[PDB]
Structures are given as structure tokens and as C-alpha cells.
């Protein structure tokens, strides 16, 4: 699964 802290700038639920 994706790691949402790989790039904090990415909001995966936008």
C-alpha cells in the first residue's frame, strides 16, 4: 500500500 509520508505534499484523497 502507499506510504502517505513518502511525500507529505501529496494528498491521496484530494
Amino acid at each position, epitope marked *: 500500500n502507499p*506510504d502517505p509520508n513518502a511525500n507529505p505534499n501529496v494528498d*491521496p484523497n484530494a
Partner: antibody
Amino acid sequence: QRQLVQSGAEVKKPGASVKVSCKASGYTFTSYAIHWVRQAPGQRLEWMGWIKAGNGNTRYSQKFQDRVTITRDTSTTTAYMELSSLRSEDTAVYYCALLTVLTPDDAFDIWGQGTMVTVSS
Amino acid sequence: DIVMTQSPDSLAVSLGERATINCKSSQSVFYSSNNKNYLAWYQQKPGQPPNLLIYWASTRQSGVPDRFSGSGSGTDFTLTISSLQAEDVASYYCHQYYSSPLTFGGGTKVEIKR
């Protein structure tokens, strides 16, 4: 116009340290993470780490964990990358970047112009 | 880490011809829960930083000419330049933001024949 302006090129001796600065302007500094990425001769772009400009938390690549320090100064909206125990593999162009800012309100991606560091006596 | 492998390493076409760049990720960058692919494409010219073209694998960034398009899902991705222009000579890089560390491909150098 959102932008990142880096400090000038440097030469440093093997074993020494280099600190590169990244001046941010034209956007809300504390909202985003600044990444550091380097581009060494003949090699792939290499992610080094990020700092959250607000609270100052960091994440470093395993490759650099023991040698890199990323900091920020909110009063001057400036981020810094310090790399110690320099070695021949470290000669490279170092970038700061707001990589893939993909939010509900915004979508942008900004890079500094790059800083060449030469490890040499 | 997620290794990003591009092919070909270089290509040359005439002005106005279609150019195709392939990128394969060593692990899937697809998340079934939100149907998204955690992939971006960059352009870089010598002496300059990279410029973002495409994100979420297929969303073209505002201001990028629409002759650029991205496609693919899972591990197999394609950057297409539908009609190569002189200003498109550059290297092109894929990028994943699925997992840490963030990684980039080795690049595809795109050239004009004239």
C-alpha cells in the same frame, strides 16, 4: 510566481561539510515540505530527504541518514541541507524542490535552480 | 526501493512525428482503494531543473501543451508526445511517490532528426 532560489556553487575538501541554502518566496512557506534531490554525473536523480517547513520534522533517505541534516528558518522562509564527511560520490548538482504538491486546492511543482558541489582538495 | 526502468534510453524522430517513452516500476504503484497510480513524468533540459509534465500517471499539469499525455496503470506506464516539436528535445523521467524513498527513472533522451 512561486520560486526557490539556491546558494551558489562551492568546492569543499574530502571529509569536510557543505551547507546549501534554499530561499522560498511567493507561497505559504509553512504549508509544504521541501525536498532535497541530487543529480550526480551519469546517475539518476536521487532523493535525499524532506523537511516540513512548518513543524520542521524531517525524513531522510537511508543512503544519507548518518550524514545529512535538513533544517529550516521560518523567519527567513529558507531551508538548508548540510552534508558531512564528503566523498568523491558527492560531487553533484543539489536541488531543493516542492515535489508534487497535489492538494484539494492546488497542484504545482517547483524546483530551485541547482547548486553544484565539487568535492576536491 | 521501487526501481523505475525506462525504455528506450534514447530516441530520435522527425519534427511532427509521434514519440513514445515507456516506464516500468518494479512494484505496482496502483492503489485499488482509490484507483490511483502514484506516478509522475518530468522533462529536463541541460543546465535546468526538471519540469513536471504529468502526475497521477495521466493528469496533465496546467500549462503543459496537450501533445503530452500519460497512460498506464500498475507497473507499465507510457509518456506520449503526439507531435514532436523542436522545443521538446530534452530528457524525460518517470517518478514514483508511492513509497519511500522517492525514486526516478534513468531517463529517455529525445532527439530531433532534421
